[PDB]
Amino acid sequence: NEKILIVDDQYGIRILLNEVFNKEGYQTFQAANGLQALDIVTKERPDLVLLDMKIPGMDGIEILKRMKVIDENIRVIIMTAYGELDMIQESKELGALTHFAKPFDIDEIRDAVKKYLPL
């Protein structure tokens, strides 16, 4: 079906995001590293990428630049802290659909993926 990659190191949030979109009808993938994420982009060509900018090892701005290079049309929605205004701008520069600050409203994320990635 339509595929969603979830790149999040916060286990509970990842497992929650996973269960929601799976219930919705999307085929989902999980990642906890930038490296594991890049791999799934290259193999699975997912439609939407939900990316926590706070991932282990690689910085979100770099895993985003890299995803772009693999698939110039990759659609990413970044998750960040409300006070990271310059970083939020950069992602915007790079091609982030939008961004949600953590902690977020799971209903708000659920509504955005359906608005950008209509199943």
CATH number at 66 reads 3.40.50.2300
Residue 52 near residue 43 (C-beta atoms within 8 A): no
Using CA atoms, how far residue 40 sits from 5, 14, 84, in Å, is 8, 16, 27
Segment holding 22, helix H or strand E: helix 11-24
Determine contact, residues 53/78, Cβ cutoff 8 Å: yes
Cβ–Cβ < 8 Å for 4, 113: yes
The per-residue b/e assignment along 40-60, b for 16 or more CB within 10 angstroms, e otherwise, is bbeeeebbbbbbbbebeeeeb
Q: Are 84 and 73 in contact (CB under 8 A)?
A: no
- Give the resolution value in Å: 2.5
Q: Kindly state the tokens that stand for 86.
A: 């310059």
Question: In which domain, by residue range, is 79 found?
Answer: 1-119
Does 9 show up as a binding residue in the annotation? yes
Run of H or E residues at 71: none
How big is the chain by its Cα radius of gyration, in Å?
13
Domain count of the fold of the chain: 1
- Is 54 labelled as part of a ligand binding site? yes
